[PDB]
Amino acid sequence: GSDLGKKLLEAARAGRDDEVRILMANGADVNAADVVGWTPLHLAAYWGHLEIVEVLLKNGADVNAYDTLGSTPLHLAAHFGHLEIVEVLLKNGADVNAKDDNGITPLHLAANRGHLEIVEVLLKYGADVNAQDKFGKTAFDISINNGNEDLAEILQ
Amino acid sequence: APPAVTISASYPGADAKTVQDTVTQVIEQNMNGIDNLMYMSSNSDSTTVQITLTFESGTDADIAQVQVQNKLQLAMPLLPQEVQQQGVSVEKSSSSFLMVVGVINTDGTMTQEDISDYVAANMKDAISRTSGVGDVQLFGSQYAMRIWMNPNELNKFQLTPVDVITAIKAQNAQVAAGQLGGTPPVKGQQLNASIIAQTRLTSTEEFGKILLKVNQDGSRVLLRDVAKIELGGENYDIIAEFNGQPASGLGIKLATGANALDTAAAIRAELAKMEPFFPSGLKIVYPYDTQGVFMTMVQLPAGATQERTQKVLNEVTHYYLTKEKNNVESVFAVNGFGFAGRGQNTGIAFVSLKDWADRPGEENKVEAITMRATRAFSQIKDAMVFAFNLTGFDFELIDQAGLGHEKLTQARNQLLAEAAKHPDMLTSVRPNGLEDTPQFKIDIDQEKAQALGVSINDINTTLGAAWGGSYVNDFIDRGRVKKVYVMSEAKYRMLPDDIGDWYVRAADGQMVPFSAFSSSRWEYGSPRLERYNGLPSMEILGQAAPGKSTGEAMELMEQLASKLPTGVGYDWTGMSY
Amino acid sequence: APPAVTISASYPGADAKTVQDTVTQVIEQNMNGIDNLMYMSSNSDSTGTVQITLTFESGTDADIAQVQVQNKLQLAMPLLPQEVQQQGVSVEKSSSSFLMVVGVINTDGTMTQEDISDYVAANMKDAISRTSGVGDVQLFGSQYAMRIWMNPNELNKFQLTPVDVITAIKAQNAQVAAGQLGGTPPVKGQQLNASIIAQTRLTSTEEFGKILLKVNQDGSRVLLRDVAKIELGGENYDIIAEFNGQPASGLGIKLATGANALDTAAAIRAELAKMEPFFPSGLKIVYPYDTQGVFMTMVQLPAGATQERTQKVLNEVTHYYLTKEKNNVESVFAVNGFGFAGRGQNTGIAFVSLKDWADRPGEENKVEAITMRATRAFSQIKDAMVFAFNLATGFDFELIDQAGLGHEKLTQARNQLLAEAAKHPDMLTSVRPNGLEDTPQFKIDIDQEKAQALGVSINDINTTLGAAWGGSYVNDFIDRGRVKKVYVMSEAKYRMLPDDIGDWYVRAADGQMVPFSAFSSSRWEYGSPRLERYNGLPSMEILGQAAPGKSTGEAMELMEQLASKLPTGVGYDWTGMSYQ
Amino acid sequence: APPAVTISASYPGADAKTVQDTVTQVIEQNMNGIDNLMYMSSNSDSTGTVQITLTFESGTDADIAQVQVQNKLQLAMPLLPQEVQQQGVSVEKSSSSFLMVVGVINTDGTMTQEDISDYVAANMKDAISRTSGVGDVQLFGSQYAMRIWMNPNELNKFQLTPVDVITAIKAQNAQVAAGQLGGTPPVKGQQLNASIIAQTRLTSTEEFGKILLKVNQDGSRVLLRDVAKIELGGENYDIIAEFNGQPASGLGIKLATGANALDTAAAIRAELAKMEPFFPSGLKIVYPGVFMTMVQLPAGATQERTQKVLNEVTHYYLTKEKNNVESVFAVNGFGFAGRGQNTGIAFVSLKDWADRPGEENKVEAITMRATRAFSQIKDAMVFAFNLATGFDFELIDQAGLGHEKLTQARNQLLAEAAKHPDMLTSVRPNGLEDTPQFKIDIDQEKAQALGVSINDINTTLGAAWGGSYVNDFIDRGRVKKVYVMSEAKYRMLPDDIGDWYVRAADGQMVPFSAFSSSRWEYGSPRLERYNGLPSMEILGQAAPGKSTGEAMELMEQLASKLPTGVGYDWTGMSY
């Protein structure tokens, strides 16, 4: 974690698009992690800053970065309802069936919060619908436990 | 001033939200039918709760306190058991210190840790009962018996933190056992005597030989065989120094309405009674007395460690002990305590100058020194370091429609963005609170926990005792009542991968690691949730730009606010009311 | 009048006798060594409520009286049932009557009464209660709670009890302190410092829906929604307001003893002005009672009377003002389930506001004539004691049990006194009891021996019975940012009739479900729904008016004579107007 | 005077150290933030009792003080044990003494002091405390409690413990909320609306006797009757009150600040004349001008022994001074600087000053004589007296030394005050001395090997030997307590310990003898603290021809010679 590393991580978090462009042109590591393994792409995917996600990826950011628990920026975007950013990440080669340490996939997360449009974009890009987390659970099982019949219908 | 009563409560190991939703909201919902209350504000930290009720100018501070204490007494049973046992305080006092009573050990026989317990066990209470003394803040902690649990050894003998706690409550008891020949007695009874059964334990020796279980062959598993046992602080958050050496002390606030000068003398008279009986080396030093003194505040960004805050306090101390030798008699510095609040990320330094007569020239007076000092400390990285003696504006952004913390933040951020686009009216419009930070979120899978026969109560006691600590009961240390705390030894509660080394016993006697029924991810949450008149809030400070007045700046802020998302309100408080 | 401190407690699911003997008596016994105390009275209701009123000398410092009363209350707090402590006992120092009513409607009809009452309770009530001068605040409605409406068939089908339900809800709607990573004392060099977030309070009907009750041996899941309906709904369903026939809620605001009526009303309108901008579309404040321009209407049916039956009377009363008095009456704010003398199912009240003084010319159009006409017209209403009045020479008689005679004998000795006062029209007109008559109650007896034989615990029986038929406050949850209560109760249809007792099951130690009828018996008996007390002993308050022209001293003097002839045990005292 | 507020709490069955380290210390630690406090002192004693006395600056509002003190205590109630909260911790201004004392007696010999006290509680006390000018009214006794007097032989016989009896009472003397038929919200169209009434509180000894403890496998029931004697009795039996040898109760009445004593005293006498027609057979009111007689037996001495001596005292006044004495009101278990089975105090009411003519029938002449007569009593100090030159010294533990070292230091100072009888005389402790006590250790290992729970052990011991306030009942429509304790004959001597059995996890009854060991040791029956630290009050006075301030300089001089960690401080009328 160097100085222009920290300047970027913080800037990617707050959505200051100008500042991200500035720091990129002065060689700021696009894979600067913080103490939990969050690259700027993690931060941007979490806090819904679409431009910065494109701009980082454009400057060669790791689309499949792991945090210290196995979780990728796609996971974050799927979990919190950031549709365009899900699309944009998967466009640049985001692993659709990435698993965190618990066996949790972006689909599991999107499913569990009932983010229906994200679920389809995911299925579209090759998303193993019979994936199981550590407790044996599919995105279907999740849809049943949440009484969410619109999703079970999408899952067929 | 307008008088302010301050409620304070605590929840060992709780987060801001837990605190807010089990304590803060509950107290606030019952603070009513109280005369002359202007407004009410509150804080809930990832440490602890402060509710501050500010009354109409002219109000009788005594009544405000009595009335308040009484409504809190009626809410007491709605609070969690853990909170009540710590004991809430309700105080009527100024929010600035009257003085600070430093305590050092010139022979170096006693550590920072030992000194603070001396102060807690022998000095604090008497000073606390001195008339004029509103609040007393210990710069350190009183000793507790610390049971530092080992999870490897606990799992070896199929015990959990639940077993430890159960045994500590059974074997560190004080039993009422009646009497021989007690009343009503049979005719001709000659003997009357007290029955003495178990008494509280007093030593590490004693706690260590608490018997946890007998194995099926016959050997004995004692508490010293699953834990390290030492006297150590109730908390470890606050550490102090006096000219760079280990120290403790008492921040003493003046009771609303008391004589400052008389209270100072009374405090001095009570300390004169104590001195004769100090251990060899202990010595009172007087680092801050209210043209003569000032403070220096240290805010690090939230998520900062004690170790890093100590680095910044060292540079602050160093500057006064080296570059300002001829003006500064002494620096009392405290890691973990800040002018506003507590936490691993803040600190304060009380500075005492040499006799006015030995600092000739306008460049060695208090204004010139503090200014130079702040200029000197502005060249410090990721830390707001500001030195000051003892008016812009004070604005609360209020959640008026159940929006949530995530949403109120965006509305706060949108107001800050707009205020930055008028440099000619508003300068440094900053938020007074803190930012969200990475926190570890762990889900208990109820299905798997049930399938394996693992109690949720045993799970959450295990989690919470190990990682946050748990006040079990009381013990007597050199004749004073003190707390017993069970918590994990530092090394088995530092990293995420350590979660999986804690085992919990199932209904069928088998050990089950947390890994088996838990799952975790990172997320962001608040380390300080604010409330203003019962509702979520965010305090924003700013000042009026040069050659422009308060009212115009306020009028602008009021206009900017009208253009915030639906359900976001505002109000003026403090100086701005 | 003289200053009064009021202790109010609530015990959900409790009958009047249980309330009295478990809450009231215990508090009462500590109410001594209180300076300037004239007298003390109290009611214990089968609505599960106590109201101890302590009345003081004139010129008594109300702040000091409240402190002295509360200081003594604290002696009893630890002896009160935990269920009472948790509801929050209150000590207040207000006038007995309202200063104003703040009404709330929805002009787009998009919010039911239940909704409106939850909005006022969660966004408006507290701020108003904190406003200075506000002695007491009474919500006409009830804040939402999470309602688990259990179905006993479904619970039996899966070998479950309400106890199981309650246990699962305490485990899975928990808010856990889990500590930190990198917390102090750290291992030197530690960089990471993060809070540990474990379970947090549930926020939605959906989250309660999925609470896991059991894994079956065949691997299928039993969720809370499989054995209950789940929804937001009132903490209780006893209080229903209307404004001009439309659904409403509101706040009855009483003035604090000694406070300035005009300043306090100003501060309320100030604090109401801060709220209005953030309302949901449709919501509106209205002002049906300010304090001749206004008057109330008391509505009291006999005990045992349902909510529906009181609603018909309130309908007939609202109808008279809205049809017959249109030219004078501006608004009517009617409340079912809350009346003058506290609360019941059998009680009600209407706040009536007239038009402008200058739109109502004639003596037959002023407050007196109107109230007279209304009162007169309502007198012909059957099975109801309705009268209308704005706000003098009667008496206030307490009949006291002073030899442990009991409630039944005291009723007998009351009636003897009333039937004798019936034979003295010359001196006494309308000697009437101020309280309620005994009504049928369902006495049930747990057979201990059969319970022990079958291996079922009494705690499990009594939790199953109380929770199903009375409700149980389990813990808190968080609704749109605010802390609120979670209540477990039977769905209405399974707690309506006596045969329903047998459909509930308790699980024994050996895993077998035992129906409630295996270990109980029941029979009808009578009993009180408002047990009165005076200066600590069981009492019955009798009201009356001196006969036309006779003085209250001469009326009082005969009541004393009549009372002399009552059985031994039975004394008397004078209260209210008749004390001085 | 200077105003003073007194916090009283009670932990029944508790010894002095238990009360100190569990209640007193905890309350002390929360007595901060209280305005105008000069000093604070407290005693913790073997009868289960704490007195904490906060003394305030002259001219301090004693009502403001009461309130600030009360609120701090209340905020600390959760820190105190359950059994202490349930007794009630009172905070009351202790400044004034009694306006007047009203004794109540029976002349038929048909009523115990428990019986009379219950009558006073239920028929007189409240009416009196409502009387014009009356503040606090203190009962000399309690109301009745339902007493369950357990039998360990009958308990073991049917394989039960006191834990079982307590559970059984909590379940069968219960009154819980059971809701309604057709309660809201109903099904619309509901006609029926009826409260459900399940168990109610029990009302009589009969109903407690029927409490079902268990059903044996042969069919037959075991009732609480079958293992306990059950009777209406007192809340506690530490004190015995006689008026001229007859059973007594009474009311101590105080005057509400503001009000007038002459008008209040007639107001009370009026109010008592009203009740006097309604009394049961032979119940009389008496009114005790007055001097006192102290009684003090040695360490370990019993109630019965103190009562023989009190009776002798009452007899001497009623015979040898029948011309001068009207009454002797005798209190056994209370005195100056004392509570306990070995202390007592007789209040002697004299006749009119008119009818005692001649210097030999005046108070001083009588008391001198009485003191001569009583000095010929074996194993008893008995001083007669009527209530200047003395001091009040607090020896203080300043470094956590503990009781034994603080006693050793008190002795060092007292032996030294003997050597200057020229300046100092009567240098003595105000307090009590250590005394024999019965230490019983539970063997943790043995209890676990047998499957005997420790909580079952400590409840069995405490419930049987110290008594236990289980819950409330309703006696003639009045809420009253229910205590479980052993019948007296099975909790008297050390051998009685082995009679008590405990059921283990497997079902076998295990005697106390199998998992406990015992011995005699010494310990305080009255521990003192001063400004929050352990203390020992020392009293004295200056000799002939010596000012009091000179004698103080010498105490201070010797006191500066004591072991390291021992300090002192001046209190009371030497402050």
Ligand SMILES: CCNc1cc2oc3c/c(=[NH+]\CC)c(C)cc-3c(-c3ccccc3C(=O)OCC)c2cc1C
């Ligand atoms: C002419 C009769 N005079 C008195 C008779 C008394 O009888 C008492 C009987 C009691 N119970 C009977 C079952 C109890 C509990 C306290 C009594 C006190 C008492 C109350 C409070 C504090 C101290 C004492 C007390 O005993 O005084 C010692 C200084 C008492 C006091 C006086 C003056």
